[PDB]
Design a protein around this ligand. Structure first.
Ligand SMILES: CN([C@@H]1CCc2c(c3ccccc3n2CC(=O)O)C1)S(=O)(=O)c1ccc(F)cc1
Ligand SMILES: CCCCCCCC/C=C\CCCCCCCC(=O)O
Ligand SMILES: CCCCCCCC/C=C\CCCCCCCC(=O)O
Length: 443
C-alpha cells in the first residue's frame, strides 16, 4: 500500500461509516438532459453557420466559440455518470486529468475569444483605413489558432495537479492535489501559495481582464461614433475619403502608429516607382484612392506586377481591367477587400467603409451577459477556496456553493446556442430552411 500527503482543505473533505451511497436522481436527470441538449444544439449550430452560411470575419469568431462549447458538453455525460454512482470517480487516473482539462480549456478559450471579438470591433471603428485593407477572414482564422495554443498552454498546470483521492467511505474524488509534484520544505506554505496562485491567475486571465477589455473597447466605440456623426452632418465633409484625424491629435507620428494608416508615405513610394507614377497621374481623385488601397494591401511590388491591368486603367478601359483583376490570386483569396477596389475602378464612385454599421451586436451583448452570469459566481467561490486555507470558517460555506456554481458554468454551453438564434434572424431563417428541406426529403 502507499500513502500521499494532502492539503488540510482536502483532508477534511476526505473525512465526511458505511459504503452505501445516496443518489440524487434529480441532479442526474438535470445533467442528463443538459448533455443531449448541449450536443444537439451546438451540433446544428456548427452546421448552419459553417456550411450553409456566408463566411465572414464575425461568423468565424462564433464558429470557434461554438466549438469550445461542443467539447464542454462532450465531457458532461461523464460527469453524469459520476453522480449516478453517488459522487465517485471510477474511471482511472489519466481520464480524471483529461476530463477536468476540458472544463478549463473551454474556460480560457471563451475568455480569449470574447476579448478578440471586442477588439475586432474596436479596430473596425477606431482605425477604419487599416481595417478595410487587412481585416480578412484568413486573418481571423489565424488568430484563433494562436488563441487555442494559449488556451492549451494555460490548462497545462490543471492537468498536472489533478489526482484521484481515496476517501474513508469508499468513494474516489477527482480534484486538486497541489502536493502531487515538487513539494517544498514547507507543505503548509506551498499548499496555500500555489492554490491562491491558481485561483487568482484564472480569475484575471479568463474573467476580469476579458471584462476589462470588453468594457474599455465599448467606450472607445461609442465616443468615436458620436464624433463621426458630427462630422457627417457637416456640409464640407460630404465627399471626403480615407480620414485619419478622427481620433484627434497631431499628424506627425503617422509612420510610428501600430495598425498603420500612413497614406502619405505610400504616395511618395508610388511616385518613386517608374511603373505606378504615370498610371497614378492618369486616374481621377476617386480612382487614385483605390490605387493607394492596393499599395496598402499587397505593396508596391505586387501592384506593379499587374502589368496588363495598369495598362488598361491608363487608357480608361475600366470594364476590361475589371475582368483582368477578377482572374487573379489577389481577388481569389480575399474577395471582399478586392471587389470593393475593382468596382471603384469601374463606377468611379467611392463606397465608404465607415458607412457600414457593425453586425452581430445583439449577439455579442447577449453572450457576454450570459458569460458574466455563469462564470461570475464561480470565480467568487474559487477565490474563497484559496482563502479557506487560512480561515477554517469559510470551509463549510465552500462545500455548499461550489458544486452548484460549477454546474452553472457547465450550463453556459447550453445557454449560448439558444441565444445565437434569438439575437440573429439570419441564423433562425437559415435554420428553418434546413429543417424544412430535411422534413421534405422524407415526404
Ligand atoms: C463535486 N466534485 C467536484 C466539485 C467541484 C468541481 C468538480 C469539477 C470537475 C471538472 C471541472 C471542474 C470541477 N469543479 C470545479 C473546480 O474544479 O474548481 C467536481 S467533488 O465531490 O470532488 C467536490 C465537492 C466540493 C468541493 F468543495 C470540491 C470538490
Ligand atoms: C461530430 C458531430 C458534429 C459535426 C457537425 C458538423 C461539422 C462540420 C462543420 C463545418 C466544417 C467546415 C467549416 C469550414 C469553415 C472553417 C472556419 C474555421 O474553422 O476557421
Ligand atoms: C441553462 C441555464 C443557464 C442560463 C443562464 C442565463 C442565460 C441568460 C442570461 C441573460 C440574458 C439576457 C439578455 C440581455 C439582452 C436582452 C435583449 C433585449 O432586451 O434587447
Amino acid at each position: 500500500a502507499t500513502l500521499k500527503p494532502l492539503c488540510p482543505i482536502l483532508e477534511q473533505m476526505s473525512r465526511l461509516a458505511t459504503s452505501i451511497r445516496y443518489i440524487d436522481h434529480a441532479a442526474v436527470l438535470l445533467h442528463g438532459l443538459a448533455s443531449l441538449l448541449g450536443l444537439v444544439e451546438n451540433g446544428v449550430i456548427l452546421f448552419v453557420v459553417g456550411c450553409r452560411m456566408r463566411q465572414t470575419v464575425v461568423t468565424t469568431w462564433v464558429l470557434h466559440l461554438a466549438l469550445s462549447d461542443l467539447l464542454a458538453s462532450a465531457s458532461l455525460p461523464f460527469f453524469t455518470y459520476f453522480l449516478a454512482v453517488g459522487h465517485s470517480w471510477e474511471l482511472g487516473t489519466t481520464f480524471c486529468k483529461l476530463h477536468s482539462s476540458i472544463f478549463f480549456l473551454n474556460m480560457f478559450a471563451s475568455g480569449f475569444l470574447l476579448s478578440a471579438i471586442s477588439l475586432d470591433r474596436c479596430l473596425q471603428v477606431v482605425r477604419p483605413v487599416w481595417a478595410q485593407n487587412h481585416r480578412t477572414v484568413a486573418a481571423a482564422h489565424k488568430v484563433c489558432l494562436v488563441l487555442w495554443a494559449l488556451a492549451v498552454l494555460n490548462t497545462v498546470p490543471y492537468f498536472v495537479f489533478r489526482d484521484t483521492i481515496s476517501r474513508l467511505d469508499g468513494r474516489i474524488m477527482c480534484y486538486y492535489n497541489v502536493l502531487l509534484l515538487n513539494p517544498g520544505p514547507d507543505r503548509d506554505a506551498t499548499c496555500n501559495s500555489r492554490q491562491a496562485a491558481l485561483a487568482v491567475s484564472k480569475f484575471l486571465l479568463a474573467f476580469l481582464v476579458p471584462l476589462a477589455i470588453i468594457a474599455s473597447s465599448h467606450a472607445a466605440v461609442s465616443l468615436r461614433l458620436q464624433h463621426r456623426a458630427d462630422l457627417g452632418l457637416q456640409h464640407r465633409n460630404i465627399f471626403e475619403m480615407l480620414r485619419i484625424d478622427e481620433g484627434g491629435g497631431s499628424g506627425g507620428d503617422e509612420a510610428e502608429k501600430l495598425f498603420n494608416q500612413d497614406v502619405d508615405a505610400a504616395v511618395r513610394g508610388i511616385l518613386r516607382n517608374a511603373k505606378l507614377k504615370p498610371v497614378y497621374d492618369s486616374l481621377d481623385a476617386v480612382r487614385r484612392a483605390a490605387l493607394i488601397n492596393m499599395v496598402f494591401q499587397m505593396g508596391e511590388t505586387g501592384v506593379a506586377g499587374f502589368t496588363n491591368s495598369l495598362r488598361m486603367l491608363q487608357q480608361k478601359r475600366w470594364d476590361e481591367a475589371a475582368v483582368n483583376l477578377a482572374k487573379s490570386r489577389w481577388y481569389n483569396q480575399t474577395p471582399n477587400r478586392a471587389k470593393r477596389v475593382i468596382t471603384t475602378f469601374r463606377t468611379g464612385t467611392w463606397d465608404a467603409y465607415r458607412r457600414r454599421p457593425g453586425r452581430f451586436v445583439r449577439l455579442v451583448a447577449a453572450v457576454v451577459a450570459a458569460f458574466a452570469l455563469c462564470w461570475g459566481p464561480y470565480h467568487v467561490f474559487s477565490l474563497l477556496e484559496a482563502r479557506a486555507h487560512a480561515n477554517p470558517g469559510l470551509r463549510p460555506l465552500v462545500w455548499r456553493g461550489l458544486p452548484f456554481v460549477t454546474s452553472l458554468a457547465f450550463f453556459n454551453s447550453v445557454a449560448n446556442p439558444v441565444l445565437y438564434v434569438l439575437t440573429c434572424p439570419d441564423m433562425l431563417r437559415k435554420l428553418r430552411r434546413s429543417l424544412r428541406t430535411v422534413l421534405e426529403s422524407v415526404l
